[PDB]
């Protein structure tokens, strides 16, 4: 059994477990055994969970951030069902009560023994919440549809559980010996070296003597640093850059001065370098795995006596306000002078005090750490700032996680993408963040699902493949069952890649109708029908993809030729008719981040009672320029609608009426008013979202509209101005908002009110967006690479202003946009 599981993990994670063994690396070895133990203990706890707790693990509640309604309810075993009138204010228990009373009369005669499953979905309604607090019940109300639910008994739930079982002394100036290299270039070589603690230099950047671009270079020279050995902090990073000159960067390499056991490193090292894009402090502290091709630098760390970093017990032994909300040197001195008052009276200003402490003086670090160990826990918002690379110390990182433990699963999920990116800043394999993420993932299967895919989707990136592979292995140890569920998804994705490659070849030699027929024949092979059917959606593990609907599958005969894959499910009814788009060839990371930020805006708006009728559809990178996008059904592009074709319900005398005519056709009679309202609200949401994020090149081919009237955007790829993008009002959109009238200030100014409300709410959470984007810098996105990009957000939310100034500013922009509109 154990051999089978090992091979299944290897295949699932995209890396052979023998490759971990072959490294013969104690740190890897230790990571693997500790984390396996941790994860297996979590699995043991899970298998004895009570049935309500199991539901909470496997099917966490989907909640929203009086009135009557029809609900259809059946029981798990039978066809017979009952359609009740209940209230949106009723609890699930009351609904389960009606259900059981009804079954008792038909079937000739305890609510608390049941949970309600949404038909055809891995989604359950349970707990003390009125029905309309559940996202599913909400969804039905706005769409019109009738909730269809299944009474599931506690013994059925337990059956699912059961089937799823598994030192201060050294004053000499720090120095190294640069021995030799083995590189490729055109000039003379120089090696620049610098010592870093995060972004901050611990002293000046001492450089090599120049040597000719011959060899196999040999230096054999001591590089002494302007810092005492007893002053090197625990997280000291040594950074090299090799380049040529008469500038031409060649390569870079970093390492920690202390190993993962706090021992100071000696003696000789061969550093396998990464090819360059001069110093890269944020770059990984692990060598380039391509040891065949990589340029290499051998260095020597001299034996300073074994020396370890002191234990905490030895460490622990050793106008303010007007500025406190970049600062001058005397201001910094005051903050450090007042550090005790900072702790006692301004605990949330911890980060500011950290940025003023002298990390290159061990005495000062001791004094900072002593305060840190008695520091009260901080709000989640503050802890997110502390995860930044500006805060490299392990005690700080440990404090940060401790304050983040109060994250709800919903919050953790909202920030998961960024927390995974922060792993790229980690210095060692076994770290507090990895343990935190793995623990949360093992306690919540939705978190487990998305953590898996965030890690899996980067296995083709050599710099993270080891770390991410090891995390995925450990996770698998803690849920054998979920591993198999994930394997099924991977098998479907393998088949989709093969199918997409086929379509790419066929469509170059034949017409779209012919290729589509070939696609269908390929899909109807038993191997494909089996691999593509009966899986949890990688986009949302609560959506079950049952039978693939071959005749509705197609492809886009342009660009990367993405696939359109439709599904149906008898058991789920209408809600089982769902689609996925598979695209191979594009980097989906930018799309994913944009969509996640818009989804976050939607949550923040709804928390203030503003529902802009957004369309937060799923986008999930799964592999190398590969991923899935959730299909929004019953929608069309603005461009297609504006073609204004004849013989259609929407055919118009003036082209400006095409979109309104289309909406009229989909929403006859009294339905038009609501659709125009959905259009207006969503238009405001997307106009604000794209303005704030600097998303340019919006046009009629990348905006879509649903038959409900809701507008949404597709195909992102440009943001934070990396095409200053103006606020955009489109004439055809103004025309719909104005109900097809030339002048309609009543409707138009309501729309302006929505924009202003949305904008002011985002500003209030400005710091959250800034902290999240700061963390996202870890991801290596070319459109989020520096301070200029963060500055874009600062400017767009006008955060340096009062609310009144910001709104005047926003108003000029909005007004300028209206003029520009034809
Ligand atoms: C559905 C449609 C109407 C009008 C013009 C184009 C499309 N459309 C679109 C338009 N589109 N794009 C997206 C989409 C959104 C974000 C992306 O990153 C992305 F790659 C695609 C999309 C979506 N999520 N839901 C519904 N429609 C969407 N996408 C296709 C993808 C694969 C295969 C096909 C045949 C299509 C396709 O026909």
Q: Where are the domains of the chain?
A: 1-47+311-479, 48-166, 170-310, 480-631, 634-822
**Within 13 Å, how many C-alpha atoms sit on residue 549's CB side?**
14
Contacts of 272 (CB under 8 A, 6+ apart): 253, 287, 288, 289, 290, 291, 294, 296
CB 297 within 8 A of CB 240: yes
CA angle 481, 484, 487 (to 5 degrees): 150
Q: Report the alpha-carbon distance of residue 486 to residue 469 in Å, rounded.
A: 15
Level-2 CATH architecture, domain 480-631: 2-Layer Sandwich (3.30)
Nearest CA to ligand 1 atom 18: 715
Candidates 667, 626, 688, 656; CA nearest to 813 is 688
Contacts of 560 (CB under 8 A, 6+ apart): 583, 584, 585, 586
Would you put residue 784 in left (φ > 0), alpha (ψ -120 to 50) or beta?
beta
The superfamily CATH assigns to domain 1-47+311-479 is Phosphatidylinositol 3-kinase, accessory domain (PIK) (1.25.40.70)
The Cβ of residue 422 has, within 10 Å, a number of other Cβ atoms equal to 23
Experimental method: X-ray
Helices and strands (DSSP H and E) totals, the chain? 31, 26
Domain 48-166 has CATH 3.30.70.20: no
- Which atom of ligand 1 lies nearest, measured to the CA of 633? 26
Q: How far is the CA of 505 from the centre of ligand 1 (A)?
A: 21
Backbone angles phi, psi at 587, to 5 degrees: -80, 115
Dihedral, CA of residue 291, residue 294, residue 296 and residue 301, to nearest 10: -60
Quick one: which of 701, 697, 702, 731 has its CA closest to 715? 702
On the CB side of 110, CA atoms within 13 Å amount to 5
Question: How many angstroms separate the alpha carbon of residue 30 from the centre of ligand 1?
Answer: 46
| Cα–Cα distance list, 770 to 144, 692, 789 (Å) | 38, 12, 10
The helix (H) or strand (E) run that includes residue 752 is helix 745-764
> What pairing do the DSSP bridges indicate for beta strands 540-545 and 535-537?
antiparallel
Question: Residue 309's Cα: distance from chain center in Å?
Answer: 35
Q: Tell me if 197 sits within 8 A of 233, measured CB to CB.
A: yes
Joined tokens for residue 466: 């080891």
User: Coil, strand or helix: which one is 179?
Assistant: strand
- Give the integer Cα–Cα distance in Å for 738 and 747: 6
Distance of CA 30 to the CA centre of its chain: 28
How many other β-carbons are positioned within 10 Å of the β-carbon of residue 754? Answer: 22
List all residues whose CB is within 6 A of at least one atom of ligand 1.
554-556, 562, 564, 581, 583, 591, 617, 619, 629-632, 635-637, 640, 704, 714-715
Architecture of domain 634-822: Orthogonal Bundle (1.10)
* Nearest Cα to Cα of residue 441 among 459, 426, 427, 454: 454
Q: Are 605 and 612 in contact (CB under 8 A)?
A: yes
Report d(CA 779, CA 785) in Å as an integer: 9
Q: Which residues, other chains included, contact 437 with Cβ-Cβ below 8 Å and sequence gap of 6+? A: 419, 420, 423, 451, 471
Give the residue, out of 704, 707, 718, 719, with the most ligand 1 atoms within 8 A of its beta carbon, to mutate for a pocket test. 704
Tell how far CA 441 is from the center of its chain: 14
Looking at residue 258, the DSSP 8-state letter turns out to be B
- Cα separation, 438 vs 591, in Å, equals 26
Could you give phi then psi for residue 651, rounded to 5 degrees? -55, 125
> For 211-330, where are the E strands, in sequence order?
211-212, 218-228, 237-245, 248-256, 267-272, 274-275, 296-301
Task: Please give the number of the atom of ligand 1 that sits closest to the Cα of 637.
Answer: 4
Strands 148-153 and 68-75: parallel
Pocket test for ligand 1, best of 581, 698, 699 (most atoms within 8 A of CB): 581
Structure tokens at 472: 């995925």
- Ligand 1 centre to CA of 388 (Å) is 36
Which residues, at least 6 apart from 224, have a Cβ–Cβ distance to it below 8 Å?
A: 173, 174, 175, 206
Provide the resolution (angstroms).
1.9
Copy the structure tokens of residue 786.
Answer: 């520096």
- Closest ligand 1 atom to 591 CA: 18
Token pair belonging to 252:
């870079």
Give the CATH H-level superfamily of domain 170-310: C2 domain (2.60.40.150)
Tokens linked to 765: 């959470």
């Amino acid at each position: 059994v154990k051999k089978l599981i090992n091979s299944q993990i290897s295949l699932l994670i995209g890396k052979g477990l023998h490759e971990f063994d072959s490294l013969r690396d104690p740190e890897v070895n230790d990571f693997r055994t500790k984390m396996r133990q941790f994860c297996e203990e979590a699995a043991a706890h899970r298998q004895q969970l009570g049935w309500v707790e199991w539901l909470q693990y496997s099917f966490p509640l989907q909640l929203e951030p009086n009135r009557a309604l029809l609900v259809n309810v059946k029981f798990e075993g039978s066809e017979e069902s009952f359609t009740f009138q209940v209230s949106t204010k009723d609890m699930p228990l009351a609904l389960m009560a009606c259900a059981l009373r009804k079954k008792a009369t038909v079937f000739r005669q305890q609510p608390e023994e049941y949970a309600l499953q949404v038909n055809g979905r891995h989604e359950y309604l349970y707990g003390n919440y009125p029905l309309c607090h559940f996202q599913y019940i909400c969804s039905c109300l706005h769409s019109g549809l009738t909730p269809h639910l299944t009474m599931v008994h506690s013994s059925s739930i337990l059956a699912m559980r059961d089937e799823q079982s598994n030192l201060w002394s050294l004053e000499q100036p720090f120095s190294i010996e640069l021995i030799e290299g083995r590189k490729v270039n055109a000039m003379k070589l120089v090696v620049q070296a610098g010592l870093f603690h995060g972004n901050e230099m611990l002293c000046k950047t001492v450089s090599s003597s120049e040597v000719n671009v011959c060899s196999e270079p040999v230096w054999k020279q001591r590089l002494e640093f302007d810092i005492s050995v007893c002053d090197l902090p625990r997280m000291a990073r040594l950074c090299f850059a090799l380049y040529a000159v008469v500038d031409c960067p060649i390569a870079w390499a970093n390492l920690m001065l202390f190993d993962y056991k706090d021992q100071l490193k000696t003696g000789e090292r061969c550093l396998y370098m990464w090819p360059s894009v001069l110093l890269n402090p944020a770059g990984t502290v692990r060598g380039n795995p391509n040891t065949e091709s990589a340029a290499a630098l051998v260095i020597y760390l001299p034996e300073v006596a074994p020396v370890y970093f002191p234990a905490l017990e030895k460490i622990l032994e050793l106008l303010r306000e007007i500025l406190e909300r970049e600062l001058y040197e005397h201001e910094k001195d005051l903050v450090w002078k007042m550090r005790h008052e900072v702790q006692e009276h301004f605990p949330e200003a911890l980060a500011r005090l950290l940025l003023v402490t002298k990390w290159n003086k061990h005495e000062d670090v001791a004094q900072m750490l002593y305060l840190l160990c008695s520091w009260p826990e901080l709000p989640v918002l503050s802890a997110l700032e502390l995860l930044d690379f500006s805060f490299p110390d392990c005690y700080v990182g440990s404090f940060a996680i401790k304050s983040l433990r109060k994250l709800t699963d919903d919050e953790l999920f909202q920030y998961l993408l960024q927390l995974v990116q922060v792993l790229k800043y980690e210095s060692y394999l076994d770290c507090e963040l990895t343990k935190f993420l793995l623990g949360r993932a093992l306690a919540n299967r939705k978190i487990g699902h998305f953590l898996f895919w965030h890690l899996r989707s980067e296995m083709h990136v050599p710099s993270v493949a080891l770390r991410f592979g090891l995390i995925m292995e450990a996770y698998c140890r803690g849920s054998t069952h979920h591993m198999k569920v994930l394997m099924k998804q991977g098998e479907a994705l393998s088949k989709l890649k093969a199918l997409n490659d086929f379509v790419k070849v066929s469509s170059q030699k034949t017409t779209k109708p012919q290729t589509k027929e070939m696609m269908h024949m390929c899909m109807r092979q038993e191997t494909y029908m089996e691999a593509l059917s009966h899986l949890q959606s990688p986009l949302d593990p609560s959506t079950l993809l049952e039978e693939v609907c071959v005749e509705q599958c197609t492809f886009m005969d342009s660009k990367m030729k993405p696939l359109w894959i439709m599904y149906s499910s008898e058991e789920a009814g209408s809600a089982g008719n769902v689609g996925i788009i598979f695209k191979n060839g594009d980097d989906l990371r930018q799309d994913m981040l944009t969509l996640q930020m818009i989804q976050l805006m939607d949550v923040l708006w709804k928390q203030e009672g503003l529902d802009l009728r957004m369309t937060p559809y799923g986008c999930l990178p799964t592999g190398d320029r590969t991923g899935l996008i959730e299909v929004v059904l019953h929608s069309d592009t603005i461009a297609n609608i504006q073609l204004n074709k004849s013989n259609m319900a929407a055919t118009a005398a003036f082209n400006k009426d095409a979109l309104l005519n289309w909406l009229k056709s989909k929403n006859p009679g009294e339905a038009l008013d609501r659709a125009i309202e959905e259009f207006t609200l969503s238009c405001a949401g997307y106009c604000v979202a794209t303005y704030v994020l600097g998303i340019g090149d919006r046009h009629s081919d990348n905006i879509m509209i649903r038959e409900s009237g809701q507008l949404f955007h597709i195909d992102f790829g440009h943001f934070l101005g990396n095409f200053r993008v103006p606020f955009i009002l489109t004439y055809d959109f103004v025309h719909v908002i104005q109900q097809g009238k030339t002048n309609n200030s009543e409707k138009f100014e309501r729309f302006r009110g929505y924009c202003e409300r949305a904008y002011t709410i985002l500003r209030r959470h400005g710091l959250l967006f800034l902290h999240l984007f700061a963390l996202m810098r870890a991801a290596g996105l070319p459109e989020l690479s520096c301070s200029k990009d963060i500055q874009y957000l600062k400017d767009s939310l006008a955060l340096g202003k009062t609310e009144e100034e910001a709104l005047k500013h926003f108003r000029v922009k909005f007004n300028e946009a209206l003029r520009e509109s034809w």
